[PDB]
Amino acid sequence: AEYRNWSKPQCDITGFAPFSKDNSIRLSAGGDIWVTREPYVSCDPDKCYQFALGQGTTLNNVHSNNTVRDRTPYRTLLMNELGVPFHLGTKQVCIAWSSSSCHDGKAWLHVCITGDDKNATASFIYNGRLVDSVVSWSKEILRTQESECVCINGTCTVVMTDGSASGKADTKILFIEEGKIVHTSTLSGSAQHVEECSCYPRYPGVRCVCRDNWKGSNRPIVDINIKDHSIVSSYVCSGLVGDTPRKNDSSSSSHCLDPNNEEGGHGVKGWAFDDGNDVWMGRTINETSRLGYETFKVIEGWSNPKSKLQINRQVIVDRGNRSGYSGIFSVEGKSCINRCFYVELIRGRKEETEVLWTSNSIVVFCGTSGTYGTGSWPDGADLNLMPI
Amino acid sequence: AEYRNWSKPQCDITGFAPFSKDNSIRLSAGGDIWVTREPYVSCDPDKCYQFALGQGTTLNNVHSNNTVRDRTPYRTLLMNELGVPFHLGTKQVCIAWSSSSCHDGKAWLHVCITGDDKNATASFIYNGRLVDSVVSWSKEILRTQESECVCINGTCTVVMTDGSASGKADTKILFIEEGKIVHTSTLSGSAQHVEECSCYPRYPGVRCVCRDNWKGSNRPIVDINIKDHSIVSSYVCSGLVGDTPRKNDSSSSSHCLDPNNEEGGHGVKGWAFDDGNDVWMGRTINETSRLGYETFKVIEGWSNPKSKLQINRQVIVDRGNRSGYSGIFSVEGKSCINRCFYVELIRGRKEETEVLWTSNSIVVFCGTSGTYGTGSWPDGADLNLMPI
Amino acid sequence: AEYRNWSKPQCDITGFAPFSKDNSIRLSAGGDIWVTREPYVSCDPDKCYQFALGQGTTLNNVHSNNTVRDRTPYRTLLMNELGVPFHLGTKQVCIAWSSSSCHDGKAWLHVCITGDDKNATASFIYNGRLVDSVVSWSKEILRTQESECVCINGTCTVVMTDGSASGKADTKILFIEEGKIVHTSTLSGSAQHVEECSCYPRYPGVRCVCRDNWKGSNRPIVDINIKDHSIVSSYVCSGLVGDTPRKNDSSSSSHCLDPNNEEGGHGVKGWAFDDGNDVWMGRTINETSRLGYETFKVIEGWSNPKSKLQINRQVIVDRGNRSGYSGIFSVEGKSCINRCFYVELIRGRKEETEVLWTSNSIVVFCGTSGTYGTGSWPDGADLNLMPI
Amino acid sequence: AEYRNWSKPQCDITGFAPFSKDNSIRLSAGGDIWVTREPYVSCDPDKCYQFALGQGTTLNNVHSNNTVRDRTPYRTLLMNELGVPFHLGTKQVCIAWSSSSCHDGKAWLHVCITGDDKNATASFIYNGRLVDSVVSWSKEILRTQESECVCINGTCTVVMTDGSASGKADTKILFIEEGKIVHTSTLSGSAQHVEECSCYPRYPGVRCVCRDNWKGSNRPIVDINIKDHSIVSSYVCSGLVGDTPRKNDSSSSSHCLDPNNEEGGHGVKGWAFDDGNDVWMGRTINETSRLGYETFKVIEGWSNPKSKLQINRQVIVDRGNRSGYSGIFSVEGKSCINRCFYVELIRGRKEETEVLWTSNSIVVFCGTSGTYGTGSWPDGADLNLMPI
Ligand SMILES: *[C@@H]1O[C@H](CO)[C@@H](O[C@@H]2O[C@H](CO)[C@@H](O[C@@H]3O[C@H](CO[C@H]4O[C@H](CO)[C@@H](O)[C@H](O)[C@@H]4O)[C@@H](O)[C@H](O[C@H]4O[C@H](CO)[C@@H](O)[C@H](O)[C@@H]4O)[C@@H]3O)[C@H](O)[C@H]2NC(C)=O)[C@H](O)[C@H]1NC(C)=O
Ligand SMILES: *[C@@H]1O[C@H](CO)[C@@H](O[C@@H]2O[C@H](CO)[C@@H](O[C@@H]3O[C@H](CO[C@H]4O[C@H](CO)[C@@H](O)[C@H](O)[C@@H]4O)[C@@H](O)[C@H](O[C@H]4O[C@H](CO)[C@@H](O)[C@H](O)[C@@H]4O)[C@@H]3O)[C@H](O)[C@H]2NC(C)=O)[C@H](O)[C@H]1NC(C)=O
Ligand SMILES: *[C@@H]1O[C@H](CO)[C@@H](O[C@@H]2O[C@H](CO)[C@@H](O[C@@H]3O[C@H](CO[C@H]4O[C@H](CO)[C@@H](O)[C@H](O)[C@@H]4O)[C@@H](O)[C@H](O[C@H]4O[C@H](CO)[C@@H](O)[C@H](O)[C@@H]4O)[C@@H]3O)[C@H](O)[C@H]2NC(C)=O)[C@H](O)[C@H]1NC(C)=O
Ligand SMILES: *[C@@H]1O[C@H](CO)[C@@H](O[C@@H]2O[C@H](CO)[C@@H](O[C@@H]3O[C@H](CO[C@H]4O[C@H](CO)[C@@H](O)[C@H](O)[C@@H]4O)[C@@H](O)[C@H](O[C@H]4O[C@H](CO)[C@@H](O)[C@H](O)[C@@H]4O)[C@@H]3O)[C@H](O)[C@H]2NC(C)=O)[C@H](O)[C@H]1NC(C)=O
Ligand SMILES: *[C@@H]1O[C@H](CO)[C@@H](O)[C@H](O)[C@H]1NC(C)=O
Ligand SMILES: *[C@@H]1O[C@H](CO)[C@@H](O)[C@H](O)[C@H]1NC(C)=O
Ligand SMILES: *[C@@H]1O[C@H](CO)[C@@H](O)[C@H](O)[C@H]1NC(C)=O
Ligand SMILES: *[C@@H]1O[C@H](CO)[C@@H](O)[C@H](O)[C@H]1NC(C)=O
Ligand SMILES: *[C@@H]1O[C@H](CO)[C@@H](O)[C@H](O)[C@H]1NC(C)=O
Ligand SMILES: *[C@@H]1O[C@H](CO)[C@@H](O)[C@H](O)[C@H]1NC(C)=O
Ligand SMILES: *[C@@H]1O[C@H](CO)[C@@H](O)[C@H](O)[C@H]1NC(C)=O
Ligand SMILES: *[C@@H]1O[C@H](CO)[C@@H](O)[C@H](O)[C@H]1NC(C)=O
Ligand SMILES: [Ca+2]
Ligand SMILES: [Ca+2]
Ligand SMILES: [Ca+2]
Ligand SMILES: [Ca+2]
Ligand SMILES: [Ca+2]
Ligand SMILES: [Ca+2]
User: Which of A20, A99, B368, C193 qualifies as a FRET site for B125, CA 20 to 30 Å off?
Assistant: First the structure.
C-alpha cells in the first residue's frame, strides 16, 4: 500500500449524479437503527464509508428522548460501509461528539473529541490504536470538521476550533503523520470566523470551505500548505452566498476577503470548490432554514464577488423537505480526482414535534462529466406514524 | 485478477437443479427484512450475489404501505451474498428504481436509474465509485434490465429503454469500460419492442432475451457484437411462447422475425437461451397471470417457429403459487459456462389483499448435466397471518 | 491452497474438552433466531462452521408452527462460523431438507437434497456454484449424512440412502472431485441398514459409523477406499451399544457383523471411532429416548462383541435434559488429527407441548490429550416462558 | 506473520485519552444485546477486540432474569471487534464462565473454564481449534484473569487460581506454545492471595497486578520469567492502594511484600503498571463500593510503601455512576508499547433493583504522551425505563 498524494487533475464536472441513500429514518420505523447527527462520507482507496455521530442509542428506544442535545458522554463515531444503514452491528470507532476521519492510503485516521465543554479532549486514532491527544486550548467546546480530513504524502490535516460561536475564536490547523500531531499552525489570513470545514485535496495543498457563524453568510475559505505549514484564508467571492441563514438572491452580496455582514450570525455546514475561476457549491434552497437543497455553478463565482450568474442548477432535495449539514469528499479516479457530496437529512426536534427524538438520514451525490436529469431525494419518513 | 472473457463452451444441460431460496417473506414475519421487488442474481468469479430493488423500508414497518408503486425516491439496489436474506445490515449499492449489475472479473458495475419519470438519471458505478451518468433520451421512464449485465474482455454491455410501454420506444445498448460509457449503439434489426433483457455471454458476443410489452407474446432476442458494436434483433422462433400474457399451447403461434400479435400487450420479464437449434426457456405456467413457473426444452424451438415439441419439463413453482420476474445469469465452470436462473416470487398487492405491502422472495436454479427429480418451491408465506 | 490428505495420526485421546455452545433457543426468546434441526459442525483449514437445516423461518414467528415436519420446500442449509448463532444474517447455502458438507482444503462442497419425497434431487455445490445433481434412485426420500462428508486428496465421499426406513434400502457411496460425481459404489459387506453416517478421515480411507433404523441397536460401520472405490461394512463390536432405542447395559448384546436384533427398529444419529482395538463413542444416556448424553471408551470394544468394559465416562448432557443427533468431525493439528463431536439439543414438539415449534441448539466438544473435569451443558431454555 | 516479542520501550505516559465506549445497556433498551459481565479488551497486531462473558441470553429476554449468578452452563466468551456492541451476530468463541485471551502475533489463544464448581475444565483453544485442557487442581472454582493473557516469542502465559476466595489458594502460572500447556510453575514469592491478574508484557518478562481477596487492599504483583519459568511476587508499594474495599486516603497504608491487612477481605479486579519508580494505577473512587473510577500517577509509588503523592488524576467515571472490573491491555506502536485500560460499567442486580438482570457496558482509555482534558463517561442507561 502507498500513500495518497492526490497528484491528479480535478475531474470534468457538468453537475452531480445520484450515488447513495440510506433511508435510515424509514428503516428505524421497523428495525433497530442508531440515532445520529453530523454525518459524513469518506473513502479508502477501494470503497466509501458513511460516518455519523451516534447518540449512544437506537431510535425505537426510550434513550432516544432528547437526542436534540449536541454533546453527551454517549456520543460515538459510527462507521459503516457506504449504504449500509447504521444497524446494531455498526462499529463505534471512538467516543466523539465532534469528529473527522480520513485514510492516508495506508490506514484510517479518526479525530475524536469528547469530554467537558470547558476542557474537551481530542484523541487521534490511526490504524486502530490511539497515538495522540490534545486538550482544548481556549476552553469552550473544542470542535472540528464533521467531515473528512485530507491526507497528502501521509500528512493529514484537520481544522479545529475552540472558543466563541458568535465572536472571535481560536482556530488551528493540525498536521498528523501516522496519528502523531507533528505541527500546529494557527488560523491566518483574512477569514474571521471558521467552523466545520469541508476540505478537499488540491495538489500540492488542501483547501477548505467553512462556516462563519458570526458575521458572514458568505463561507470562509482556508488554504493549507502541507509542506511548509503556511495558512491563508478568505471568503467565497461568488455573489450568491452559501450559508443559511442568508439574504435572498436579489438582496445578497459577498466579498472575497471579508464577511458580508449579511444575516451572518449562525450558519450551517456546507461545501464548495473551485472550477478555474468558476465555483461549484451547494446550499439549502430556503434562505433562512434547512429546508431543501440545491447545487449550482456560479460562473466567475470564485474570483468575482459581484457575479450572480448561476448555471447547472440541480435540486437535490426539494424546498418542502428538510436538509441539514452537507460536506465534500474526494474520490480518486483512473486519471482524475472526482468531487462528491453528502447531505444530512435531519428529522425530529426541535422543528418537528410529532416525535421526541432527533436523527438524520443521508443522500450522497458525485461529480459526473456525463449527462443527468432531475429529481428529489428527501428523507421519506412519515413522522405522524413513527415510534409514538 | 483478469477480465472475464467467457471464452468457453456452454455446459451440457439436461435440465435444472435446485440452488438457492431466501424465504424472505416468511422471515419478515418475525424479523426485519427489506421490502423488495425486481430481484436478480449475479456472481463474481468466486461466488454469487442476490440483488433487488428495495422500497427503502422493511416489511414489519409502517412505510411498507403502498410498496405496490414502481418508482419512489427511496428505492435503492440491495446487494447481498446469495442466500443471505435482505436483513437490515444489507448494503444499498446505489439509488435505483431500475438497475442492472455485473462483474468484469476485476470489479462490479452497477447501472442505477433514479429521479423524475420524465428526466431520470442513470448513474454508472464501477469499483465503488461513480464514473458516468446519462439522462433519459426520450423522457419517459428510462429503464434497464433488472438482471445482470454481461462483460467480455472488460467491455460491459447493457440494454436500456426510454419511452412508451405500449408503442414504439427507444432502446439503446450502451458499452462500458471501467464504468465509462464508451459507445452507444441504438436498437436495430427486426425486434419491435424491447424491455428487461435477460442477457448472457455467448463468446464472442452477448445475447439477450427480452420482453415485448406491445404486440408480442413471443420474446425478443438481441445480439450484441462487443467488438464493433453492431446490433441485430428478432424473436424466439419456438411455437410455445414465453411471455405472460400469452395464448394457450394449442392456440399459440410465434414468428422468428415479428411479434406474434397474440395477447401481446403487457408482459413479464423472462429468459431463454439457445442449445444448438433447440431452445431452453422458462415461463409462468398460467398463461394470463404470474401464477406458477415451469421450464422446458423446445426441440428445434430456436430455429423453427412451428415447433411445439417440448421435453424435460420441470415445475419450478406449482400453478397455485405466485411467480413473477425471472432472469438468466451465467457461471463459469472449469471447462464450460453454465446457465442459471432466479425466479421472483411476488407476494402482496394488488393480487393479494390480506396485507397492504408488496414484496418478493426468490428461488434460484442452475443448469446441470446430471440427473434430477421433481418438486415445487413456492414462497411459503401465509399472508393470513402476516403483519396486520 | 493444497488438498487435505489427513495423512497424520489420530491424536491421543483421554476424553473430551468443552469447545462451543450456541444457546440458540434461549436467544430466540428475545431475538430473531432461525428454527433448525439436523445440525453439524465442519471446519475449513482455519476455522469451524456450524451448519443446520433451517425451516425457512425464525422462532418468534408465526411460520414456526409445525416445524416438527421433516421435509418442506422452505428448508435450507444454514452455514455460520462456529459459535455465531443462526441470526437473520446467516447465509443459506442451498435448499436442503437433507444435507452434508466438507472442505477439500481448497473449497466447500455442499450436498443438498430437496424436492418430492418420491423423486428428490441432490445438488452438488462446490466453490459457490452448482456442478452436479442426481435423482433419487429408489424413489423414497433420498437422504444423506446430516454431518460432514470427508475429502482426501480432493476426492470427497458421501453416504446416501434411498428407500425404506424399516426394511432393506439402497445405500450408495458417491465420490466427488470438484463437485463432480466421478463414481458411485453401492453399499457392500455385512451392514444391513445404513443411515446418517458420521464419517471421518482415517488415512488412506474414510470411515463411517452409521444408524441402523431396522434391526440394530448396534451402529453400522462403513469403510471407504477412496482410491479404488471399494466398500466393506459391519457393526461396532462393543457390547455397550450406541443407538437409541437400545436394551439396558446388563441386558444388551452386540455382534461385529450383524444387527443385534435388539429394539433395533428406529434409531438416532450418532458417532464412534476406533482407538487401536478400543472404541470411543457417545450416546444418549436414557436407553429408549433422546434424554441426556454421555461419552466413554469401551476397552477392546472395537474388536470384541462381548466387552462391556467402559472407562473415561463423561456426562455431556445430564439425563433430565434433552439431546438428539450427534456426529463426528475432524480437525487437523500440527502433528495429529483430532476428533470432535457436536450434539443436537432438541427442544419443542412432539415431546414438549408448551410451544408449537421444533428447534435445537448445539453444544460441541473436542478430543483432548490433557486432563478434564465434570459438568452438564443442556439447552437451558425455559419453555414455560417462550413465545406463547 | 511473526511472533510478538514486545521488545520495545513502554510509551511516554502523561495520562489517558478516550478510546472506546459501547453503550451496550442503552442499546439493549431497543435492540437485541447480549447480557454480559467480566469483559476485557485485547488486540491483534492490527486492531482491538472487546470480549465478555455472556449469560447465554440477550437483555430484553425472559432468560435475563437472575444473570446475577456467576457460573452457569450457558456462559460463553463473546468476541467482537472493539466498539461493535454484543449484538446477536456476535461470535461465542468458547464455553466459559472464566476466561482470558491473547494473540501471539500469529493466532488467538482463548483460555476457557466451564463445568462443575468442584471439577471445572480449562480448555485451551488456539487458531480456532482445541489443543489442550486441564482439570481443576484444588476442586473449588478453577478461575483465571478475565483480561488478556500475554505472549512473548510465542509463549503465552496465564495466571489461574483454584481454591479458597477468603483463605490460601493454589495459584499456578501456565505456559502455552501454540495452545499447548508446555510447563506449569506454581505461585511463588511473597504474594499471599492472587486473583484476576491484569497482566502486561514487560520485555523480557510478563508482569501482572492482581486482586488479593483475603487480607490485602493493596494489590499483588506477579513477575513471570518466560524463558526459565521462574515466578516472584509482592505487592504494589504505593501508599494509596488500589483494591475495593479499602481504607480512605488519610487512613490507608500499604507494604511492598505483605498484605496491608486493611479491609482486605473481598476485592475488585484492577490494574497498575510501573513507570520507573512511579506507578500508574486506577481504581474505584468510592472506597467501599464499585461507584466511580479514577486514575493517577503515584510518584515513587512503585518502590516506596509510604508515598501518597499522586499527580495527573483523571476522573474516568464520576462518583455517582457505577464502575466494576477494570484491566490493562497493551498495544504495540511504531517505536513503543502503549498501555490501555477498559472499565466494566456494571448495571442491574444486586445493587440496582429496578430490573431483574445484571449486565455491563464498557468504556476504554489509552495511554497518551499528548495533552488531555476532563470528563465523565458513565453507562448512561436509565434503569427506570428499561425492559420492565
Ligand atoms: C432534465 O434535467 C436537466 C438537468 O437537470 C435539465 O436541464 C437543466 O435545467 C436547469 C434549470 O432550468 C439549468 O440550470 C439553469 O441554468 C440557467 C442558464 O441560462 C441559460 O444558459 C445556457 C447556456 O449558457 C442555455 O443553454 C440555456 O438556455 C439556459 O437557460 C440559469 O439561468 C438558471 O438559474 C435560474 O433558474 C433557476 C432554476 O429555474 C432559478 O432557481 C435560479 O435562481 C435562477 O433564476 C439555472 O441555473 C441547467 O443548466 C440545465 N442543465 C443542463 C445540463 O442542461 C432539464 O431542464 C430537465 N428537463 C425537464 C423536462 O425537467
Ligand atoms: C422424477 O423426475 C423426473 C425429472 O423431473 C421426471 O422425468 C421427467 O418427466 C417429465 C414430465 O413428464 C418429462 O417431460 C416431458 O417430456 C415429454 C417427451 O415425451 C417423451 O419423449 C422421451 C424421449 O423422446 C421419452 O423417453 C419419454 O417417454 C417421453 O414421454 C413431453 O411430451 C412432455 O410435454 C408434455 O407433458 C407435460 C408435462 O406433463 C405437459 O404439461 C406439456 O404441456 C406437454 O403436454 C414433457 O415435457 C421429462 O422429459 C422427464 N425428464 C427426464 C430427465 O427424464 C419423472 O417423471 C419424475 N418421476 C416421478 C415419479 O414424479
Ligand atoms: C472430576 O472429573 C474427572 C473426569 O471427568 C472424574 O474422573 C472420572 O470419573 C469417571 C466416572 O467415575 C471415570 O469413568 C469410569 O471409569 C471406570 C473405570 O474403573 C476404574 O479403573 C481405573 C483404571 O483402570 C481406576 O483408576 C479407577 O479407580 C476406576 O474406578 C468405570 O467403571 C466407570 O463405568 C461405570 O461407572 C459409570 C459412571 O459412574 C456408570 O454410569 C457406568 O455405566 C459404569 O457402571 C466409568 O466409566 C473416569 O475414568 C474418570 N476419568 C479420569 C480421567 O480419571 C472425577 O471423578 C471428577 N471428580 C469429581 C469430584 O466429580
Ligand atoms: C483540564 O484537564 C486537565 C487534565 O485533566 C486538568 O489538569 C489536571 O488537574 C488535576 C486535578 O486537579 C491534576 O491532578 C492533581 O495533581 C496534583 C499535583 O499538585 C501540583 O503539582 C504540579 C507539579 O508538581 C503543579 O504544576 C500543579 O500546580 C499541581 O497542583 C495533586 O495534588 C492532586 O491530587 C489531589 O487532588 C485530587 C483532585 O482534586 C484529589 O482527589 C486527590 O485525592 C488529591 O487530594 C491531583 O492528582 C493534574 O495533574 C492536572 N493534569 C495536567 C496534565 O496538568 C485541568 O485541571 C482541567 N481544567 C478544568 C478547567 O477543568
Ligand atoms: C423527555 O425528556 C424531557 C426533558 O428531560 C422530559 O421532561 C420528558 O419527561 C421526557 N419524555 C418522556 C416521554 O419521558
Ligand atoms: C422557509 O422556511 C420557513 C420556515 O418554516 C417557511 O415558513 C417559509 O415559507 C420558507 N421560505 C421560502 C422562501 O420557501
Ligand atoms: C395506505 O396507503 C393508502 C394510499 O395512500 C392510504 O389511503 C391508507 O390510509 C394507508 N393505509 C394505512 C393503514 O395507513
Ligand atoms: C390463471 O389465473 C387466474 C387468475 O386468478 C385463475 O382464475 C385461472 O384459473 C388460472 N388459469 C389456469 C389455466 O390455471
Ligand atoms: C398450527 O398448525 C396446526 C396443524 O396445521 C393447526 O391445526 C393449528 O391451527 C396451528 N396453530 C395455530 C395457533 O395457528
Ligand atoms: C427415559 O425417558 C422416559 C421418557 O420420558 C422416562 O419416563 C424414563 O424415566 C427415562 N428412563 C431412565 C432410565 O432414565
Ligand atoms: C426470577 O428468578 C427468581 C429466582 O429464581 C424467581 O423467584 C422469580 O420468579 C423470577 N422472576 C420472574 C418475573 O419470573
Ligand atoms: C460510597 O457508596 C455508598 C454505597 O451506596 C454510599 O452510601 C456512600 O455515600 C459512598 N461514599 C463516598 C465517600 O462517596
Ligand atoms: Ca453564517
Ligand atoms: Ca422487533
Ligand atoms: Ca408481451
Ligand atoms: Ca436402530
Ligand atoms: Ca424486537
Ligand atoms: Ca482485597
Answer: A99
Q: Quick one: which of C65, C57, C87 has its CA closest to C355?
A: C65
Q: How far is C333 from chain D (nearest CA, A)?
A: 8
Residue B24, φ and ψ in degrees, nearest 5 = -55, -40
Amino acid identity for residue D348 in this structure? G
**Nearest to residue B25, comparing CAs of B14, B11, B39?**
B39
Separation between Cα atoms, residue C328 and residue C281, nearest integer Å: 10
Taking Cα atoms as reference points, which of B171, B173, B111 lies closest to residue B146? B111
- As a whole number of angstroms, the distance between CA A90 and CA D83 comes to 8
Q: Which of A177, A26, A188 is nearest to A106 (CA)?
A: A177
**Which of A106, A121, A125, A143 to substitute to test the interface with D, most D CBs within 10 Å?**
A121
β-bridge mates for residue C202, sequence order = C205
d(CA D293, CA D286): 8
Distance CA B53, CA B70 (A): 10
Domain coordinates in residue numbering, chain B: 1-388
Name B272's Cβ contacts closer than 8 Å, sequence gap at least 6: B198, B209, B219, B236, B238, B242, B279, B280, B281, B282, B328
Element (H, E) at D25: helix D24-27
**Residue A61 and residue D29: Cβ atoms within 8 Å?**
yes
Backbone torsions φ then ψ of B314, nearest 5 degrees: -130, 135
A117 neighbourhood in chain D, CB within 8 Å: none
A 10 A CB-CB count for C249 gives 12
Of C46, C85, C368, the CB nearest to D132: C368
What are the cell numbers at B376? 415445487
Give resolution in angstroms. Answer: 2.6
The CATH class given to the B1-388 domain equals: mainly beta
Are C238 and C280 contacting, i.e. CB atoms less than 8 angstroms apart? no
Q: Are residues B30 and C60, on separate chains, in Cβ contact within 8 Å? A: yes
**What are residue B62's phi and psi, to 5 degrees?**
-60, -30
The bound ligand whose nearest atom lies closest to the alpha carbon of A355 is 5
User: What are the catalytic residues of C?
Assistant: 70, 325
**Residue nearest atom 4 in ligand 6 by C-alpha distance:** A289
Residues 6+ apart with CB under 8 A from D105: D1, D2, D3, D4, D45, D151, D154
Option in D87, D333, D373 nearest A120 (CB): D373
Burial category of D369 from C-beta neighbours within 10 Å (exposed 0-12, middle 13-18, buried 19 and up): middle
Quick one: which of C182, C210, C187, C188 has its CA closest to C197? C210
Cβ proximity of A59 and B89 under 8 Å: no
CA-CA distance, C53 to C79, in Å (whole number)?
9
Nearest to A190 by CA among A206, A171, A204: A171
HEC assignment per residue over chain C? CCCCCCCCCECCCCEEEEEEECCHHHHCCCCCEEEEEEEEEEECCCCEEEEEEEEEEECCCHHHCCCCCCCCCCCEEEEEECCCCCECCCEEEEECCEEEEEECCCCEEEEEEECCCCCCEEEEEECCEEEEEEECCCCCCCEECCCCCEEECCEEEEEEEEECCCCCEEEEEEEEECCEEEEEEECCCCCCCCCCCEEEEECCEEEEECCCCCCCCCCEEEEEECCCCCEEEEECCCCCCCCCCCCCCCCCCCCCCCCCCCCCCCCCCCCEEEECCEEEEEECCCCCCCEEEEEEEECCCCCCCCCCCEEEEEEEEEEEEECCCEEEEEEECCCCEEEEEEEEEEEECCCCCCCCCEEEEEEEEEEECCCCCCCCCCCCCCCCCCCC
Cα–Cα dist B302/B10, whole Å: 16
Instruction: Work out which ligand 7 atom sits closest to the CA atom of B65.
Output: 1
Question: Of B46, B371, B385, which is closest to C128 when you measure between CB atoms?
Answer: B46
| Cell numbers standing for residue C55 | 425451516
